[PDB]
Design a protein around this ligand. Structure first.
Ligand SMILES: CCCCCCCCCO[C@@H]1O[C@H](CO)[C@@H](O)[C@H](O)[C@H]1O
Ligand SMILES: CCCCCCCCCO[C@@H]1O[C@H](CO)[C@@H](O)[C@H](O)[C@H]1O
Ligand SMILES: CCCCCCCCCO[C@@H]1O[C@H](CO)[C@@H](O)[C@H](O)[C@H]1O
Ligand SMILES: CCCCCCCCCO[C@@H]1O[C@H](CO)[C@@H](O)[C@H](O)[C@H]1O
Ligand SMILES: [Cl-]
Lengths: 4, 182
């Protein structure tokens, strides 16, 4: 999961 | 007295509630509900185009995102009104999430796309339209540039949604330009  | 208006406040509450749900239920159970639509059958669950911005996966990025939201969001709401903040927030969450999923697919979250929109918006509106009463301090310009750089070069622990961030920034700059045409 990528975080913004 | 209070710096944070209703919209600033309600977003912060939303992020805290979602964060707590994620610690209780685990990140993945909450993503399945709140993530950008990851299948055609979910494409009309319209909240998902926005609710990706409410999830955070680490203590550091929820804190930093909410600090910038509280400051910039707070400044926009105070000076330009709750409506303006709502529109920057919805538009930037939508378009940043579009760009991110487009390049990297739907497994992402965080308020940083919106934060980058606020950075861009506050900077350029202050530049082009100083009578607006908003302005991005030099120190915050420097802070934001380093944070962006850190994101781009993977200097945090974690995998970064650089699509969302940079798209966020473009949305904020665009909206500020349109808002200051005059
Ligand atoms: C750990 C420190 C104490 C925790 C306090 C828990 C939250 C209490 C609710 O706060 C109040 O919510 C209102 C909702 O509209 C507003 C107001 O501005 C704010 O003061
Ligand atoms: C989520 C981080 C927000 C911290 C805000 C602290 C501001 C207190 C200073 O008052 C001005
Ligand atoms: C954690 C302390 C918070 C101090 C608030 C000062 C504004 C910083 C804004 O940066 C974004
Ligand atoms: C479309 C109207 C925008 C909201 C204006 C009400 C003030 C809320 C934020 O404090 C200024
Ligand atoms: Cl995060």
């Amino acid at each position: 999961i990528a975080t913004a | 007295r209070e710096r944070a208006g209703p919209v600033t406040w309600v977003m912060m509450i939303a992020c805290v509630v979602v964060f707590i749900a994620m610690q209780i239920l685990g990140d993945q159970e909450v993503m399945l509900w709140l993530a950008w639509p990851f299948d055609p059958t979910l494409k009309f669950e319209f909240w998902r185009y926005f609710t990706h911005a409410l999830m955070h996966f680490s203590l550091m990025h929820i804190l930093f995102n909410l600090l910038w939201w509280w400051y910039l969001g707070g400044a926009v709401e105070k000076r330009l009104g709750s409506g303006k903040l709502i529109v920057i927030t919805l538009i930037s969450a939508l378009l940043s999430g579009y760009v991110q999923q487009k390049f990297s697919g739907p497994w992402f979250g965080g308020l940083s796309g919106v934060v980058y929109a606020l950075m861009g918006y506050v900077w350029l509106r202050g530049e082009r339209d100083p009578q607006s009463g908003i302005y991005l301090q030099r120190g915050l310009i420097i802070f934001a540039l380093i944070w962006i750089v850190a994101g781009w070069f993977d200097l945090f622990g974690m995998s970064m949604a650089n699509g969302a961030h940079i798209a966020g920034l473009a949305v904020g700059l665009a909206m500020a330009f349109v808002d200051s045409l005059n």
